């Protein structure tokens, strides 16, 4: 199924996933599209952080749900 991931610029990435995918596997799919290492990523859905070790289905994420990718910005 397709899901969307929003980034800080407002641009949306499209991923192909299954509900049994781990959050670490999703972060690898984002790396393939954006070149960001998994260790630098945090993901949010429905107001909560998605934790490594869980699956998409553990959060009731469905077809065409939108996740948010958060990075650390220095200044």
């Amino acid at each position: 199924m397709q899901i969307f991931v929003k980034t800080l610029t407002g641009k949306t990435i499209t991923l192909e996933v299954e509900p049994s995918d781990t959050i670490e596997n999703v972060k690898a799919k984002i790396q393939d599209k954006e070149g960001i290492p998994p260790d630098q990523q945090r993901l949010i859905f429905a107001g909560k952080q998605l934790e490594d070790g869980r699956t998409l289905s553990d959060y009731n994420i469905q077809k065409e749900s939108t996740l948010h990718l958060v990075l650390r910005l220095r200044g």
């Binding site: 800080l8 610029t9 630098q40 990075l71 650390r72 220095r74 200044g75």
Partner: protein
């Protein structure tokens, strides 16, 4: 061990969350992404329009925060008296869209480079806009920024009228360079100034700093050590209750 490291968007957000627990009128606006010099006025107008809608009992038009429930965000818009508008700046990009691309590129590299943190405080109760640049004139001369903000204050009097007719005023906080002794202490300076302002909205603390740069920097290091201890165990990516 007097270190002041370059503060990122995450520690600045946690400091805001903590400052709300102490002063509930402060709304902990998210920093992922923060505003820029090219959209801070639009962001503030959008927030004030939503606060007016919550006061009338109407729906909000957003945009919504990502780490807050929609109902908690409505409760914070009802409560708030003070907007802490962090702005991220880089001297190379010259539009909003080019500044957002520069921000992503540096985020992914992990580099500070020539980027800087500025603060605009919107004091709703005092009707005051306060601009804090720790570097004094990093973006432009201060007399130029005062003129831009005076025109914006006139717009805010139409967008967000008081019961009486009081007009928004403008304060340029820094009368000369504040940040001496380090190239990377801007985010820490912004949070220290915001805490002084919360304690006293007429604060003159910027005009009472040590003269030598190594002592002034040591004092800010003490603030940084205390703030990091205070936020360490508070919830990651989660707004406090209004």
């Amino acid at each position: 061990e007097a270190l002041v490291p370059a503060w990122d968007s995450d520690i600045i957000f946690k400091a805001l969350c903590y400052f709300h627990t102490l002063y509930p009128g402060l709304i902990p606006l998210e920093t992922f992404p923060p505003a820029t010099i090219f959209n801070f006025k639009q962001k503030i107008i959008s927030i004030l329009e939503d606060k007016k809608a919550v006061l009338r009992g109407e729906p909000i038009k957003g945009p919504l925060p990502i780490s807050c429930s929609k109902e908690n965000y409505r409760r914070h818009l009802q409560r708030t008296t003070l907007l802490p508008v962090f702005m991220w700046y880089h001297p190379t990009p010259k539009t909003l869209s080019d500044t957002m691309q520069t921000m992503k590129q540096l985020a992914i590299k992990g580099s500070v480079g020539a980027s800087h943190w500025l603060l605009v405080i919107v004091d709703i109760q005092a009707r005051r806009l306060v601009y804090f640049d720790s570097l004094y004139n990093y973006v432009m001369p201060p007399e130029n920024m005062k003129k831009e903000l005076q025109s914006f204050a006139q717009q805010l009097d139409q967008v967000y009228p008081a019961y009486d007719s009081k007009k928004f005023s403008v304060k340029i906080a820094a009368k000369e360079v504040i940040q001496r002794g380090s190239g990377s202490s801007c985010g820490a300076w912004c949070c220290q100034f915001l805490h002084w302002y919360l304690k006293d909205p007429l604060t003159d603390a910027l005009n009472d700093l040590p003269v030598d740069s190594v002592e002034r920097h040591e004092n800010l290091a003490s603030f940084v050590q205390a703030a990091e201890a205070a936020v360490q165990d508070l919830p990651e990516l989660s707004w406090p209750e209004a």
